[PDB]
C-alpha cells in the first residue's frame, strides 16, 4: 500500500504556545500545492489526530484502510539543537535531518484567553464540517460550511480569529474527494463513537454534533419518499400502480439495514449501491410523496421541481389524498 507520513508530537513538546504553532504548520503543509493530495491528506490526519491523546492507537483503531499505510513520525524538541526552535523529526533511534528541514525549513493572544484545547478545537471542527457537503454536494460546500459554522461561532467553539478561508475549505474538500483514505478514517471514527460513554472530550462532543449532519447525506430523497409516502400510511398505497415502486423501496430499506452502521455513509463513501437509492429508480412513489409533502410541508416544491422523472398523475393523487387527511 502507498505509504502516507503522519507526524505526531512527542512527550518532549509540552508548551501550549508551541503546540498551536505545530498545528498551524500542519494546516499549512496540507494547503501546500507542491505536495501531492495524499501527502497533504496525511498532514490533515496529523492535525485531526492531535485531538486524540494517542494518535498511533487512534489510527490503528480507525485508520485500518486498504488504500494507504500510515507511518507515524514523532516530532520532539531537542534542547541541544538551535535550528527551527529546537524542533526535530526523530524516530526512536534516529533524527530525520532532511524531513526536519522539510517540515520546518521549507518555504497567540487567543491561546492565553481561551486555551490550547479550545483553540485546536476551532481548527479541527472546521475540517469535519467540510465533510457534510464535500462528497455529497460539492457545489454547496462553502454555503453549507458557513451554515454549520454559524452555530459554533456564536457558542464561541470557533473564535473569529481561527475561522478558515474559503480557499482553505475548497482545498480540504478536494483532498477529501481525492483521498477516500481520509473519509474512511473519519467515518470509522464516527462509528467507533457510536458506543456512548461519559469519556467524550469537548471536541468529541462537537464531532458527534457535526456527525448528525454528516450521517445521512445524499439519501435525503429516499427518506422524504419514506416519510411523506410510506409513513403517512394513506389508502393509495393499496393501488396496483404504486405496488412495484413500494417493493423496491422495501428492498432499498432492507439493503440499508444490511450495510449496518456503515449504511448512513453510503453516498459519503461512494459505495457501488449509492445510485440505487436515487428517486429515478422508484419514480411513482417519489412523485406521490412529493405531492403529499407540498400539501403537508410549507413550500418544499423548492426541494423538488422540473425532475425528468416526475409522474404528474401520482403527484396530484398525493396532494388530493393528503388534503382529505388534513381535513381530519
Amino acid at each position: 500500500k502507498n505509504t502516507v507520513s503522519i507526524f505526531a508530537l512527542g512527550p518532549t513538546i509540552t508548551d501550549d504556545d508551541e503546540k498551536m504553532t505545530l498545528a498551524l504548520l500542519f494546516l499549512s503543509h496540507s494547503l501546500d500545492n507542491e505536495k501531492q493530495h495524499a501527502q497533504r491528506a496525511g498532514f490533515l490526519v496529523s492535525l485531526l489526530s492531535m485531538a486524540y491523546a494517542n494518535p498511533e492507537l487512534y489510527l490503528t483503531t480507525n485508520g485500518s484502510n486498504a488504500d494507504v499505510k500510515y507511518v507515524i513520525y514523532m516530532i520532539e524538541k531537542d534542547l541541544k539543537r538551535q535550528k527551527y526552535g529546537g524542533f526535530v523529526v526523530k524516530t526512536r533511534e534516529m533524527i530525520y535531518e532532511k524531513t526536519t528541514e522539510w517540515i520546518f525549513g521549507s518555504d497567540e493572544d487567543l491561546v492565553h484567553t481561551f486555551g490550547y484545547p479550545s483553540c485546536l478545537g476551532a481548527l479541527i471542527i472546521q475540517i469535519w464540517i467540510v465533510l457534510v457537503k464535500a462528497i455529497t454536494s460539492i457545489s454547496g460546500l462553502r454555503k453549507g460550511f458557513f451554515t454549520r459554522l454559524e452555530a459554533f461561532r456564536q457558542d464561541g467553539t470557533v473564535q473569529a480569529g481561527l475561522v478558515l478561508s474559503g480557499d482553505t475549505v475548497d482545498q480540504i474538500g478536494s483532498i477529501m474527494r481525492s483521498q477516500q483514505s481520509l473519509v474512511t478514517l473519519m467515518v470509522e471514527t464516527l462509528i467507533t463513537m457510536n458506543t456512548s460513554r461519559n469519556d467524550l472530550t469537548t471536541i468529541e462532543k462537537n464531532i458527534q454534533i457535526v456527525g448528525n449532519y454528516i450521517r445521512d447525506a445524499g439519501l435525503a430523497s429516499f427518506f422524504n419518499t419514506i416519510r411523506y409516502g410510506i409513513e403517512t400510511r394513506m389508502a393509495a398505497l393499496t393501488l396496483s400502480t404504486l405496488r412495484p415502486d413500494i417493493n423496491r423501496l422495501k428492498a432499498l430499506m432492507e439493503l440499508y439495514l444490511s450495510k449496518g452502521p456503515r449504511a448512513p455513509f453510503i453516498c459519503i463513501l461512494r459505495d457501488p449501491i449509492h445510485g440505487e437509492f436515487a428517486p429515478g429508480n422508484y419514480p411513482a412513489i417519489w412523485s406521490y410523496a412529493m405531492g403529499v409533502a407540498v400539501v403537508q410541508n410549507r413550500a418544499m416544491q423548492q426541494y423538488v421541481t422540473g425532475r425528468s422523472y416526475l409522474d404528474i398523475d401520482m403527484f396530484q393523487l398525493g396532494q388530493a389524498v393528503a388534503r382529505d387527511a388534513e381535513a381530519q
Binding site: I230, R233, L237, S240, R243, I246, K250, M253, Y256
Partner: peptide, 23 residues
C-alpha cells in the same frame, strides 16, 4: 438514527403487502 424511521416503515410496508395481496 433513521433506524427507527426505516424500522417503522418496513413494518408498515410489510403490513400493506401482507394485508393487500398483489394490490
Amino acid at each position: 438514527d433513521k433506524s427507527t424511521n426505516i424500522s417503522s416503515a418496513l413494518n408498515i410496508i410489510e403490513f400493506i403487502l401482507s394485508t393487500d395481496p398483489q394490490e
